[PDB]
Structures are given as structure tokens and as C-alpha cells.
Design an enzyme around this catalytic site. Sequence first.
Site, short mmCIF file in Angstrom:
data_model
loop_
_atom_site.label_atom_id
_atom_site.label_comp_id
_atom_site.label_asym_id
_atom_site.label_seq_id
_atom_site.Cartn_x
_atom_site.Cartn_y
_atom_site.Cartn_z
N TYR B 27 0.76 -1.25 0.00
CA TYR B 27 0.00 0.00 0.00
C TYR B 27 0.79 1.30 0.00
O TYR B 27 0.25 2.35 -0.33
CB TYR B 27 -0.96 0.02 1.19
CG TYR B 27 -2.13 -0.93 1.06
CD1 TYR B 27 -3.21 -0.62 0.23
CD2 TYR B 27 -2.15 -2.15 1.74
CE1 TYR B 27 -4.27 -1.51 0.08
CE2 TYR B 27 -3.22 -3.04 1.60
CZ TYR B 27 -4.27 -2.71 0.77
OH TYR B 27 -5.32 -3.57 0.61
N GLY B 29 3.01 4.17 -1.23
CA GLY B 29 3.40 4.78 -2.49
C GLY B 29 2.45 4.50 -3.63
O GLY B 29 1.77 5.38 -4.16
N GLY B 31 -0.87 2.53 -5.64
CA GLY B 31 -2.31 2.58 -5.40
C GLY B 31 -2.95 1.68 -4.34
O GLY B 31 -4.01 2.01 -3.80
N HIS B 47 -4.03 5.71 5.10
CA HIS B 47 -3.79 6.98 4.42
C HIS B 47 -4.58 7.02 3.11
O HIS B 47 -5.17 8.04 2.75
CB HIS B 47 -2.31 7.15 4.14
CG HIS B 47 -1.96 8.48 3.57
ND1 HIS B 47 -1.27 8.63 2.38
CD2 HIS B 47 -2.20 9.74 4.02
CE1 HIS B 47 -1.12 9.91 2.12
NE2 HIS B 47 -1.67 10.61 3.10
N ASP B 48 -4.56 5.89 2.42
CA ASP B 48 -5.30 5.69 1.18
C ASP B 48 -6.78 6.00 1.45
O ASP B 48 -7.40 6.84 0.78
CB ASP B 48 -5.30 4.24 0.84
CG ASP B 48 -4.31 3.89 -0.22
OD1 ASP B 48 -4.52 4.29 -1.39
OD2 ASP B 48 -3.33 3.19 0.11
N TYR B 51 -7.68 9.55 2.22
CA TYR B 51 -7.75 10.36 1.02
C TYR B 51 -9.04 10.11 0.25
O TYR B 51 -9.64 11.05 -0.30
CB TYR B 51 -6.54 10.06 0.12
CG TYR B 51 -5.33 10.93 0.36
CD1 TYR B 51 -5.08 11.48 1.62
CD2 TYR B 51 -4.45 11.22 -0.68
CE1 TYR B 51 -3.97 12.31 1.83
CE2 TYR B 51 -3.34 12.05 -0.47
CZ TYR B 51 -3.10 12.59 0.78
OH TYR B 51 -2.03 13.42 0.98
N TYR B 67 -2.35 22.93 1.75
CA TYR B 67 -2.86 23.22 3.09
C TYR B 67 -1.81 23.98 3.88
O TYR B 67 -0.72 24.25 3.37
CB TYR B 67 -3.27 21.95 3.87
CG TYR B 67 -2.27 20.82 3.88
CD1 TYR B 67 -1.09 20.90 4.62
CD2 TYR B 67 -2.51 19.66 3.14
CE1 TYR B 67 -0.15 19.84 4.61
CE2 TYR B 67 -1.59 18.61 3.13
CZ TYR B 67 -0.42 18.70 3.86
OH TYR B 67 0.50 17.68 3.81
N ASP B 93 -2.41 13.42 6.20
CA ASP B 93 -0.95 13.39 6.10
C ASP B 93 -0.32 13.39 7.49
O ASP B 93 0.61 12.63 7.76
CB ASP B 93 -0.45 14.59 5.29
CG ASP B 93 -0.82 14.50 3.81
OD1 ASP B 93 -1.22 13.42 3.36
OD2 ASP B 93 -0.71 15.52 3.10
#
Lengths: 119, 119
Positions: B27, B29, B31, B47-48, B51, B67, B93
Site C-alpha cells: 500500500y 506509495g 495505489g 492513508h489511502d 484520502y 494546506y 498526512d
Amino acid sequence: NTWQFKNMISCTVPSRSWWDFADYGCYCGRGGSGTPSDDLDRCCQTHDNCYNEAEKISGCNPRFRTYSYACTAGTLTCTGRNNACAASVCDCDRNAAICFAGAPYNDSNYNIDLQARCN
Amino acid sequence: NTYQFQNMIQCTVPKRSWRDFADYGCYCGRGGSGTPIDDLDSCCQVHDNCYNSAREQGGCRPKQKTYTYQCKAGGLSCSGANNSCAATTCDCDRLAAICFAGAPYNDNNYNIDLKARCQ
Ligand SMILES: [Zn+2]
């Protein structure tokens, strides 16, 4: 729709799986960086640019947008019933599958060290 | 955005280049799909998903969105002067970066053959 993109690749390159393109070169897989390193990979880079463009459309999520298309005997056709977003995304995937079936698959390019190859 | 997210990683993981998290597990870096292989790879999954939840907001693209944040003494903070989208992708993040600092890094899980390991 990432899944429909997998079917397209199979519709044009039945001798392989999307996994073969999941980690190839610098641009195939997902995030790109550096020099394409290959025509096949160059295809993937274009595929990204295509998505970046398609993402300008309002609320267009390339990865999740389910479009309408047909695979008949190796031919891919995006149908008319799609709207602005679906149509654009379907075309990107469609063009990639063709570019894929047209480029040679270099096994030495599968799984490379992005750090020392895509800087 | 990525340069911001990347700068966050440099803040909490100074002894390691962000390039090390660009092709880790199934996972990090790339997709992502399949099952995580360690705590670190799991951080990336979260994190995926984070998002993808940030996409539920109109015109919100985590990757390209800028941001406001600060890295001090290793402690990330997302500023209050951030709109809905920025505030959420920043928080994503931030949590990811913090998770990277605590998760152990396994070299055997860097640039692995996805086809055989993820599914
Ligand atoms: Zn890899």
C-alpha cells in the site's frame, strides 16, 4: 473504475494480468516520476496525464467512475450512454489498453528500484 | 499536497528518505490492494482510505491541494486557518507521518513482487 480498466487490459492482452503492469517502469502502477524508461511505460505516463485532465471535470473520480463499454473479440468501444466524466475516463483506459497490446513487455523492467532509476 | 506531505515525512523520519516509503509493502506509495504485511504498510492503507474520504468533498483533490501546516521539533500541526478540504487532507498526512515514525521499517518489505504478495 479501476476494475473496468483491468478487463480492458485483458481484452487486449489476454496473455497477461494487470499485475504485470501494476509495478512496471516508473509510471505504470500509479505515481510516476523520472524518465518513462520504456514505450510501454510511456503508455502508462500518458494514462496519467489523461486522468489528470479528466479530473478537471467536476467531481470526476477516474478510479471509481463506472463507465459503459464493450470488449468484443479484442476490440474496445466506449459506448454513447456515458456522460462527460465517464466518457473521458473510458477513453483514457481504452487508449491505454491499445497502447499496452502494442508495446513489448520487458521483464527486466518489472519491479525496479524507483530510487535508482526514476529520480 | 505531496511536497507538503513529503516534507512532513522528512520531519518525523529524518534518518530516512521519503523514497523509502514510495514502494513499500502493498500500500505504500503505489495505489494499493491486498492485505498489509506490517504495521507500516498498514499506515499507508489508512492513508489511502483517508484520502478517498477526502474526495467525498466537492473539488477536493488531496494530491494537488495545498494546506497550511507546521513541523516543529518533530511535531506536526495543521493550522486552523484551513478550509474543509485542506483541513482534512492535512489531518490525513499528519496522522500518516506520525504512524511512519512509530512503525518499524522492514527492508524485506520494500519493492516486493506485488503479483505474488498482494492479491
Ligand atoms: Zn515495486
